[PDB]
Symmetry: C3
Subunit: 534 residues, 3 copies
């Protein structure tokens, strides 16, 4: 008939994309360097009706973004404080007055004067000291040890990741969603919930719970090279303690440089440990196994302790009160499944190497007084051995963050598109995504306004401006530099689409339309420009 | 040459030293567009 | 004033921090600094002779 190409700007469609997210948050906490903005007290969420979106938590790049930011916050926080290089001296370690794993070591240090030395004493844990005037600190032949800045807390603070202009974060609200495939209930959020950067290994602590059942999710449930994340719908409490009453002693190493050493232990020498109720753990496993037999045939399932390797892998590690615990979980993962209190002994280390980075040790100063913390086991990390065998494990931190970020996806908004019309020359952002084209075209200002809304942030902002200007330059070239709806003189070709006006405007959505003419947009764009020059 | 103006107009937009170069390219573009808006023809390559 | 008693004396800040010497070629003589407004902003000046704070 007489249909013409009409250009619409601010169209609610999107394509998958990677970008830089900014944090939002709400002393001297290690996770609060204030490189990022405060949160909005009332974040918005818009349910997109009739939107199906394919998610894949294993390919999610928000995970890589979080992992990198976490490492940087940690490293920035350790820069402004004392190096323990001066302590790499021979230690004389004995056990003369401690027990009837902790050594009493004497050594020579300098004072604030470079011409003077004194003999001092400190207690060290056996795991931090290696034999060679008998002993050496464990990392003196590898690297310099930085002590944790003493006023910095390691207690996690929820971090929200929020989208930059031109982008949106979609959230999957399917209660049974495992991690991949279509989500039938998708909402747009300004940003994520707060995610606590809790560091742990075999058991995931203080995370989110599943709402209906235990969800077992993996990239490939039949592989052995992939880990399995098990999300519980009920928490199990774990009570951990450090029963020794340690005294902190302050040793002057240099001109304003203090070292914090463990002084005498008051009272009994006792072993650190964690308490898990016996019945709650057993109910948890009955449920985990019941749901594991839904992926595996009806085979005997056995749980074993991990096979070996570094303490950071074989034990359950965590930061409790600022001390670093390495707990033995062989008391949990030791059972066979077919058709009281658990006490886990723990070790404490002061010299640690986080995120598996060799050559960058940190010394955690001792914390004075007794320590107790109560954590929630909210999930497990399991691995299959080559009857099925499962062992706890995986020291790769990205698998912890995948358990919180699995619901989120980042997409880029693609505001420009065309459709045939007969002219001739409040839902909120993306709320109209599920609306038909003839309804969604009435809310174009909503998306157009969201295109403008350190170095990584300057690059993101400069680029958002450049993207905006390139689209405006293009519209100026085609004509209608100031319009959201622009009628052109290019006749519509029924070969691009032979759908009627009612089929296009009353039934279809913009997201579907974008697919129907995806192979013709370069032709159409060239015709619009060529016709302007005539 | 007046028939190939879009070719050059598109090439006006196409560490710290690079951010300064990019911020400045944007500012130069906008100053020329502001000037055209003042003269008239804010959206045109050829303005009578 | 720079030395404190404790082989008798110590520099005054050796138990507190590291002392950086000034660069011997760097003058401390003040140079007038003018502050200027960025685009979108203006600086207003008050010219009342008896104006107080
Ligand atoms: C999972 O989520 C769980 C719940 O959030 C976490 O458990 C919680 O972990 C936090 C941090 O470890 C625990 O909070 C600590 O509690 C200590 C004891 O407080 C008690 O006694 C106080 C006495 O005054 C009282 O006021 C409290 O109300 C409470 O009764 C606190 O001492 C500790 O304080 C730390 O932070 C303070 C911030 O201002 C700081 O001032 C403190 O300084 C003191 O200690 C330093 C040590 O060097 C000294 O130098 C100072 O001079 C001073 O003595 C100190 O830094 C903090 O509040 C929380 O209690 C615990 N909850 C439960 C139920 O136990 C889990 O840990 C999470 N899981 C994981 C893996 O993270
Ligand atoms: C689809 O997902 C949305 C978002 O989670 C659900 O909407 C929430 O429903 C609860 C039920 O009371 C409300 O309390 C929340 O305030 C709603 N959130 C929003 C953003 O509106 C919705 O119920 C889900 N629909 C289905 C069929 O599961
Ligand atoms: C390392 O410490 C031990 C601690 O026993 C020292 O051995 C003896 O310690 C007693 C403690 O009263 C002294 O009376 C002895 O004289 C010490 N032995 C000797 C041979 O002197 C040990 O000497 C210390 N070594 C170093 C290098 O400090
Ligand atoms: C630095 O010293 C440590 C401690 O002696 C060395 O670590 C040991 O390396 C051997 C190599 O076979 C292992 O068998 C030991 O189990 C390791 N000990 C510990 C405590 O882990 C380390 O290799 C040395 N590094 C260098 C560069 O020589
Ligand atoms: C998570 O749920 C998805 C969706 O059902 C599963 O994906 C399907 O897996 C089967 C396995 O044979 C495939 O045949 C289907 O084609 C997949 N569907 C899609 C949309 O890709 C996924 O396997 C589940 N995850 C786990 C660990 O079981
Ligand atoms: C550990 O799990 C317990 C529940 O078993 C959490 O306690 C309650 O959690 C609900 C969640 O909606 C809150 O509404 C209640 O107010 C909480 N109880 C109390 C006394 O506040 C507990 O908060 C969980 N701990 C962690 C670290 O998540
Ligand atoms: C999930 O893992 C299974 C098991 O490793 C993969 O199936 C194997 O694929 C290789 C390809 O060379 C075959 O040689 C094996 O014989 C297959 N094993 C079985 C049991 O059939 C499967 O392809 C993986 N799926 C994905 C999506 O990665
Ligand atoms: C751990 O040891 C410290 C030091 O002994 C105890 O704290 C107090 O220290 C002062 C120092 O003069 C004593 O006068 C107090 O009497 C000590 N407290 C008590 C209750 O006697 C600290 O309380 C001990 N910690 C625990 C949990 O017992
Ligand atoms: C971990 O600690 C918590 C609280 O410190 C324990 O919870 C208490 O358990 C007793 C059991 O009789 C109840 O009477 C209390 O009312 C509970 N307190 C609260 C605040 O709920 C928990 O049982 C401990 N877990 C283990 C394994 O010992
Ligand atoms: C966790 O604790 C268990 C025992 O509670 C340790 O297992 C023992 O390891 C020694 C090492 O030679 C063996 O001789 C014992 O026979 C083992 N006991 C059992 C019951 O098999 C285990 O090694 C500890 N794991 C870690 C990581 O410390
Ligand atoms: C897993 O649990 C079983 C029992 O539930 C442990 O079996 C014990 O093995 C030791 C080995 O010397 C025997 O002396 C005990 O008598 C056995 N106990 C029973 C009840 O038969 C097994 O060792 C545990 N595995 C681990 C790694 O701790
Ligand atoms: C999601 O799809 C449903 C079903 O097509 C839409 O509901 C229709 O909305 C139109 C709006 O004019 C009504 O005239 C129809 O009567 C509704 N159908 C039914 C069965 O009630 C719904 O509006 C769509 N969501 C969005 C955002 O457009
Ligand atoms: C510090 O300087 C004083 C300066 O008088 C030294 O004292 C005596 O100085 C005279 C100078 O000719 C010498 O002849 C004496 O022999 C010095 N006294 C002694 C006991 O030797 C003083 O010794 C100096 N001290 C140090 C540590 O340098
Ligand atoms: C470093 O040494 C200086 C010099 O002794 C200390 O400064 C003195 O501190 C006392 C504290 O009561 C004052 O009364 C003196 O008047 C101070 N002396 C001077 C010259 O100001 C300083 O406090 C020491 N610093 C540390 C960290 O111990
Ligand atoms: C400290 O230095 C003195 C100097 O003689 C030496 O005798 C002593 O053994 C040294 N201490 C240690 C632990 O090396
Ligand atoms: C410490 O030195 C003594 C000296 O005889 C030696 O007997 C002992 O075995 C040494 N211990 C270590 C850990 O080297
Ligand atoms: C957790 O899942 C199990 C699976 O049967 C269910 O029986 C239990 O009631 C669920 N718990 C909650 C809190 O929904
Ligand atoms: C856990 O369940 C198993 C099932 O065989 C049972 O034998 C074991 O005694 C149970 N443990 C507790 C603490 O009830
Ligand atoms: C449709 O495409 C064909 C391809 O040759 C072209 O000849 C025809 O003129 C086009 N029609 C419109 C309306 O552009
Ligand atoms: C310096 O050392 C001498 C040694 O006898 C002492 O008499 C004098 O009082 C000391 N002076 C100071 C400032 O310490």
């Amino acid at each position: 008939e007489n249909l013409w190409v009409t250009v619409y700007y601010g169209v609610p469609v999107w394509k998958d994309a990677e970008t830089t997210l900014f944090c939002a948050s709400d002393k001297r906490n290690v996770w609060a360097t204030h490189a990022c903005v405060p949160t909005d007290p009332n974040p918005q969420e818009i349910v997109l009706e009739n939107v199906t979106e394919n998610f894949n938590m294993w390919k999610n790049n928000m995970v890589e973004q979080m992992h990198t930011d976490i490492i940087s916050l940690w490293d920035q926080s350790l820069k402004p404080c004392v190096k323990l290089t001066p302590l790499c001296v021979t230690l004389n370690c004995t056990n003369v007055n401690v027990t009837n794993e902790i050594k009493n070591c004497s050594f020579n240090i300098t004072t604030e004067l470079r011409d003077k030395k004194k003999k001092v004493y400190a207690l060290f844990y056996r795991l931090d000291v290696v034999p060679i005037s008998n002993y050496r600190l464990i990392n003196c032949n590898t690297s310099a040890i930085t002590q944790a800045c003493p006023k910095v807390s390691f207690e996690p603070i929820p971090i929200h990741y929020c989208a930059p202009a031109g982008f949106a974060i979609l959230k999957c609200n399917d209660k049974k969603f495992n991690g991949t495939g279509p989500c039938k209930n998708v909402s747009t959020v300004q940003c994520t919930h707060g995610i606590k950067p809790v560091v742990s290994t075999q058991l995931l602590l203080n995370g989110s719970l599943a709402e209906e059942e235990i969800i077992i999710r993996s990239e490939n449930i039949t592989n052995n090279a992939k880990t399995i994340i098990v999300q519980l719908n009920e928490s199990v409490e774990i009570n951990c303690t450090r029963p020794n009453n340690n005294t902190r002693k302050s040793i002057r190493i240099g001109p304003g440089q203090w070292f914090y050493a463990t002084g005498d232990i008051i009272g009994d020498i006792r072993q650190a440990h964690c308490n898990i109720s016996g019945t709650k753990w057993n109910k948890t496993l009955q449920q985990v196994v019941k749901k594991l037999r839904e992926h595996f045939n009806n085979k005997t399932i056995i749980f074993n302790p991990s096979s070996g390797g570094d303490l950071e892998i074989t034990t359950h590690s965590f930061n409790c009160g600022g001390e670093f615990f390495y707990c033995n979980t062989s008391g949990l993962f030791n059972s066979t499944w077919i058709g009281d209190t658990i006490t886990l002994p723990c070790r404490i280390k002061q010299i640690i190497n986080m995120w598996q980075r060799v050559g960058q040790p940190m010394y955690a100063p001792p914390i004075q007084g007794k320590i107790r913390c109560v954590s929630n086991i909210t999930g497990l990390l399991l691995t299959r051995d080559g009857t099925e065998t499962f062992r706890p494990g995986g020291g790769d931190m990205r698998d912890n963050w995948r358990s919180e970020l699995y619901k989120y996806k980042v997409v880029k908004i693609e505001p420009l598109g065309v459709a045939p019309t007969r002219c001739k020359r409040f839902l909120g952002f993306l709320g109209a995504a599920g609306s038909t084209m003839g309804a969604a075209s009435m809310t174009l200002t909503v998306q157009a306004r969201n295109l403008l809304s350190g170095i990584k942030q300057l690059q993101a902002r400069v680029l958002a401006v450049e993207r905006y200007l390139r689209d405006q330059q293009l519209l100026g070239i085609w004509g209608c530099s100031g319009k959201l709806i622009c009628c052109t003189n290019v006749p519509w070709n029924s070969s691009w689409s032979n759908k009627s006006q009612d089929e296009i405007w009353d039934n279809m959505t913009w997201m579907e339309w974008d697919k129907e003419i995806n192979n013709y947009t370069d032709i159409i764009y060239s015709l619009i420009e060529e016709s302007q020059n005539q």
